[PDB]
Design a protein around this nucleic acid. Structure first.
Ligand code: MG
Ligand code: MG
Ligand code: MG
Ligand code: MG
Ligand code: MG
Ligand code: MG
Ligand code: MG
Ligand code: MG
Ligand code: MG
Ligand code: MG
Ligand code: MG
Ligand code: MG
Ligand code: MG
Ligand code: MG
Ligand code: MG
Ligand code: MG
Ligand code: MG
Ligand code: MG
Ligand code: MG
Ligand code: MG
Ligand code: MG
Ligand code: MG
Ligand code: MG
Ligand code: MG
Ligand code: MG
Ligand code: MG
Ligand code: MG
Ligand code: MG
Ligand code: MG
Ligand code: MG
Ligand code: MG
Ligand code: MG
Ligand code: MG
Ligand code: MG
Ligand code: MG
Ligand code: MG
Ligand code: MG
Ligand code: MG
Ligand code: MG
Ligand code: MG
Ligand code: MG
Ligand code: MG
Ligand code: MG
Ligand code: MG
Ligand code: MG
Ligand code: MG
Ligand code: MG
Ligand code: MG
Ligand code: MG
Ligand code: MG
Ligand code: MG
Ligand code: MG
Ligand code: MG
Ligand code: ZN
Lengths: 50, 61, 114, 151, 91, 69
RNA sequence: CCUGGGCAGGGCGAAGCCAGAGGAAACUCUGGUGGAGGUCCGUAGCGGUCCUGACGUGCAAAUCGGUCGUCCGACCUGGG
RNA sequence: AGAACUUUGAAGGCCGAAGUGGAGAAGGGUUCCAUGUGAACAGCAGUUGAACAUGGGUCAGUCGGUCCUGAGAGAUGGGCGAGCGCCGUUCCGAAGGGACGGGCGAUGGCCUCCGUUGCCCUCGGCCGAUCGAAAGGGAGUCGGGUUCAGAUCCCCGAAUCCGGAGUGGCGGAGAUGGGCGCCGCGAGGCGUCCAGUGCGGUAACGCGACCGAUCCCGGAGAAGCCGGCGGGAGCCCCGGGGAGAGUUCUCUUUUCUUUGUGAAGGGCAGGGCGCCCUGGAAUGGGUUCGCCCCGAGAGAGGGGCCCGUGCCUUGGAAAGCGUCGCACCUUUGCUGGGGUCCGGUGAGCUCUCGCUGGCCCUUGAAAAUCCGGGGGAGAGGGUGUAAAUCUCGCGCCGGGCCGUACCCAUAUCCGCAGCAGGUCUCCAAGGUGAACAGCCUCUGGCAUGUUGGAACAAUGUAGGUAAGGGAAGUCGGCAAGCCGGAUCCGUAACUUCGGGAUAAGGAUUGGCUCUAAGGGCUGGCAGCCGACUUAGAACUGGUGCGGACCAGGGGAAUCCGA
């Protein structure tokens, strides 16, 4: 919506923060087995549901 | 503008270029309104100009 | 020939938004929202269809800005009643009090004999 | 949702300095400005309310009470009235004939406005179509469609 | 300019709703819309506002009367009997 | 704004406390002395240049008069 | 139920009103005005008769093109 | 590096104002912008993208929420229930914690005077807490400019609303007069007393303000739908002038774009009045398109009130916009001219305002805030000195919190997706035409809808014709086909008398010259100004004329359902 409330905007803020790629400085960490982020949500494919 | 001048002169206004009713092209109500207003203000002017008294003005109205 | 848009978030032609289009000094047309017209007050028990004269006809919350001289009439029942009903009530009151005096003196003249 | 008109009557409070507004059933034959008298020793006229124990027999009244203090429950529809037919000084009772033809005995202390309810003959007009019946019942309640049981 | 033979105000309905129903509703369609003489002012301005409500256009003295007429033949005799009972034996 | 027509009140308004700004606008047969205040903007227009050339010097000094154009 | 929004244009011509003519009278007739209808053609909207048309692993887990019924209302619709 | 899909220019086209345009509400939540790569995503490709990576982007007293109740949901009192709890919302409740004033007592500020605290007296129906609308009610911001992304928010300029003033900010009202005597030529001055909570018009009512406590009364908020009519504005149209642009083989003073005044305050046109005074009519009157109104006061004359969204003025020409230029190509500002030029018409479209009428077994919402009036509990200096109060003109201070980008869609929503599906609103031009029908263009968008090249076999999907017959095919006139608009005549059986009915059946329809009729304004019957409607006739085209589009086959009967 064009106008929303503070709670919904704060909830969307964390999704915006989380929708970020994997940093390239942890790939060389000892014991690291993460190759790519499996929680990347697309605005068109997967709807977060309010 | 040339076609409008032709319409004003009377061209392209025959029966073959009419697609609406007569009451749709010129409303009988507004024709009656004009014909009534003209005669009514003419009668007002004639009564004011002392040409006709009120007893004749009412019977003419 | 130039189609303009609304200026607020309201998108429905409701009663809250009545737009009239005006021309700016910048040579362009734009809507302006108009406040709903205020109706002049009507008298109490007086003439029904006739509103009160001399009283400013504007919205209720605007009456805080208006002066008392522009919200009432100098006579009694100025901004509350019309002119006809004021003198009507005056005559009615005077006449019914005179009738009370008449019935009192009638009771007295009947008591003086009976 | 009602055929009988509602007359607003303003009385003067006998204990406080204030005007009391009441909504009575406008009996047929009253106009705005007519003084209406409410009490025991009120004059017998159209519109005035007064206990049934004081009115004579054969008085055509309406908007009466079953019990003293019931505040106008019987004979409230448009064009209906109740007929006082008997009186009893001792063991105060009063026989009245209601619009249904039933003769009921009631107390002699409850009141009744004199006159027939305005809006009589309201049923003489045919609805003449379903639209008017729909517009009539939309103000009353959702009970009009009335589908038959055998269907 | 006689435009209709027998049907009057109920000519707006047309061919529907039957014949006897229109004939019966016409009698009161004549009355409920005709202006009456005000018993207080004296002018023929007594257009009905709602069911049983009749207000004048001059003094606006509204009166409660019949649903389709200014007064009903039943209320007339009711008022007559009320007056008679009031005058008999001092109310 | 407020238009001033008399000769006695515009100077009284210009000698007030909130008369920080006074501007002069020259037009075709028109001279406007606009004095800006806290709430309004008083404007006095005159069509005579002789009544303006002798009045411009009558303004109180130190009010930062700005001649437009 | 509450609160808001919307329905181009034409046809038929109800009550009421004015004028003229005929008649001994009752009254009748004629030309206008008037603009009613759960009225008619028809758009937007609302539904979906027929072609049993196309698709029928489709655009679509019910759609599309003509042809349709109603369009001042027992009307259509948003939010609560 | 790579081009048909990207970009620029040109040409040819579509959407054509009920759009393939410009904005919104729900919903999406970063999709908006800039830069960069091109393995994945885009149904082919891609230098492109709503994909990827990085970095930015949403600024409010006057936009909305926040306030108010509507249908409705809901706790306590109380009741029920083994029980989480439920019914119930004014019912079976000691359900007002606040104030006007007076008195006693204490405290603080310059203890002169006031502000508070504790107690006593008097007064005071809640229509019962509370929630419930980003379309209902609800005070108050408009013009110009600014960015790669923001606009009533940012800057400039011009206003306005609501709160505060205790040692009360300055002005103006209330505030200033009359009588007696004396002095002075006079103007004036002095001593005593008294008045003074504003004025004017006969009125409808007016002004720069106009003492007011409990209480009471009333209004506004606060009203249905649909016909008509009139006023105002915008858009459309014509004629003249100026700037710029297009054609000029020939003609055309021709054709195209533009030619301004916002909120606020004052004045004046205009509209409305069921508002007042003189006087009272019938031989009835003046009036509307229609009605309506008059002895309960018509016509006429003179006044008053409300809206004044229109005109001029402050704002207001210094900004804004087309034009020809001087510096300048990361310093780009500034020149002067013309724009606020003269008008007109209109059953023209849209919005608004006002009058009136019609429709009914339909009467078309409440609440919060605010105002006016009646009452007269009280307060005020008491007089050539000045107070109680001011809804008057100014001046000072503040206005907290929340959202503000973008899509709003045959590609940013839902339908498993860039899905002929679905989804609530505003603006809406020119020509033909009765018209927002259909068709063609302008402002504004677009690449033909998830690809192109070559050919035109059968079959298929849409579209149109066919000699003679005209339903002989088929269960069936299924489909297809005929008429289709307008003007003028003529319209049957039946009937509930309203209809049938555009019954049926006939004639005309083009183009260019004409004729006649249908109006307004100025003066004591004449002179000018502009709209398109009708009727008739002449001439003429290879009987073609609704020349495209638009668009009722009809009749006779049965059965059923008004
Ligand atoms: Mg290892
Ligand atoms: Mg989920
Ligand atoms: Mg007609
Ligand atoms: Mg609102
Ligand atoms: Mg049934
Ligand atoms: Mg069944
Ligand atoms: Mg219909
Ligand atoms: Mg038919
Ligand atoms: Mg249709
Ligand atoms: Mg279908
Ligand atoms: Mg369907
Ligand atoms: Mg079927
Ligand atoms: Mg099929
Ligand atoms: Mg197939
Ligand atoms: Mg159809
Ligand atoms: Mg049909
Ligand atoms: Mg129809
Ligand atoms: Mg290109
Ligand atoms: Mg083209
Ligand atoms: Mg539209
Ligand atoms: Mg659109
Ligand atoms: Mg790239
Ligand atoms: Mg691909
Ligand atoms: Mg983007
Ligand atoms: Mg991304
Ligand atoms: Mg600001
Ligand atoms: Mg607000
Ligand atoms: Mg409960
Ligand atoms: Mg309990
Ligand atoms: Mg609330
Ligand atoms: Mg701006
Ligand atoms: Mg933007
Ligand atoms: Mg203030
Ligand atoms: Mg209009
Ligand atoms: Mg103005
Ligand atoms: Mg106009
Ligand atoms: Mg936005
Ligand atoms: Mg789609
Ligand atoms: Mg679609
Ligand atoms: Mg057009
Ligand atoms: Mg035309
Ligand atoms: Mg292509
Ligand atoms: Mg697509
Ligand atoms: Mg053939
Ligand atoms: Mg043939
Ligand atoms: Mg044949
Ligand atoms: Mg045959
Ligand atoms: Mg057969
Ligand atoms: Mg067929
Ligand atoms: Mg036959
Ligand atoms: Mg037939
Ligand atoms: Mg001529
Ligand atoms: Mg049927
Ligand atoms: Zn009356």
């Amino acid at each position: 919506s064009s106008h929303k409330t503070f709670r919904i905007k704060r909830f969307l803020a964390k999704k915006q923060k989380q929708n970020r790629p994997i940093p390239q400085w942890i790939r060389m960490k000892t014991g690291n087995k993460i190759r790519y982020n499996s929680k990347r949500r697309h605005w068109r494919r997967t709807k977060l549901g309010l | 503008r040339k076609n409008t001048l032709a319409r004003r002169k009377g061209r392209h206004m025959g029966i073959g270029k009419r697609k609406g009713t007569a009451n749709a092209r010129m409303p009988e109500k507004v024709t009656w309104m004009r014909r009534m207003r003209i005669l009514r203000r003419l009668l007002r002017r004639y009564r004011e100009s002392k040409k006709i008294d009120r007893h004749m003005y009412h019977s003419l109205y | 020939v130039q189609r303009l848009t609304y200026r607020r978030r309201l998108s429905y032609n409701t009663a809250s938004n009545k737009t009239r289009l005006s021309r700016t000094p910048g040579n362009r047309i734009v809507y302006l929202y108009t406040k709903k017209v205020g109706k002049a007050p009507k008298s109490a028990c007086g003439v029904c269809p006739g509103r009160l004269r001399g009283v400013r006809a504007v919205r209720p919350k605007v009456l805080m800005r208006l002066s008392k001289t522009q919200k009432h009439v100098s006579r009694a029942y100025g901004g509350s009643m019309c002119a006809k009903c004021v003198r009507d009530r005056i005559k009615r009151a005077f006449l019914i009090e005179e009738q009370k005096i008449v019935v009192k003196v009638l009771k007295a003249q009947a008591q003086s004999q009976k | 949702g009602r055929g009988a008109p509602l007359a607003k009557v303003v009385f003067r409070d006998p204990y406080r300095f204030k005007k009391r507004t009441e909504l009575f059933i406008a009996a047929e034959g009253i106009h705005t400005g007519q003084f209406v008298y409410c009490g025991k020793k009120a004059q017998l006229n159209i519109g005035n309310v007064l206990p049934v124990g004081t009115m004579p027999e054969g008085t055509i009244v309406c908007c009466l009470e079953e019990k003293p203090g019931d505040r106008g429950k019987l004979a409230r529809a448009s064009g209906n009235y109740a007929t006082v037919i008997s009186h009893n000084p001792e063991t105060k009772k009063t026989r009245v004939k209601l619009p249904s033809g039933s003769k009921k005995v009631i107390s002699s202390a409850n009141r009744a406005v004199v006159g027939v309810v305005a809006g009589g003959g309201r049923i003489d007009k045919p609805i003449l179509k379903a639209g008017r019946a729909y517009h009539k019942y939309k103000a009353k309640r959702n009970c009009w469609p009335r589908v038959r049981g055998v269907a | 300019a006689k435009r209709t033979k027998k049907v009057g105000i109920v000519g707006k309905y047309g061919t529907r709703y039957g014949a006897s129903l229109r004939k019966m509703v016409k009698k009161i369609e004549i009355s409920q819309h005709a202006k009456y003489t005000c018993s207080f002012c004296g002018k023929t301005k007594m257009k009905r506002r709602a069911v049983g409500i009749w207000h004048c256009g001059s003094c606006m003295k509204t009166v409660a009367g019949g649903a389709w007429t200014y007064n009903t033949t039943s209320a007339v005799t009711v008022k007559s009997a009320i007056r008679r009972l009031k005058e008999l034996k001092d109310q | 704004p407020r238009k001033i027509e008399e000769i006695k009140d515009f100077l009284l308004t210009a000698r007030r406390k909130d008369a920080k700004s006074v501007k002069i606008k020259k037009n075709k047969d028109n001279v406007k002395f606009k004095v800006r205040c806290s709430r309004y903007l008083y404007t006095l227009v005159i069509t005579d240049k002789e009544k303006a050339e002798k009045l411009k010097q009558s303004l109180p000094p130190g009010l930062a008069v700005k001649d437009l154009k």
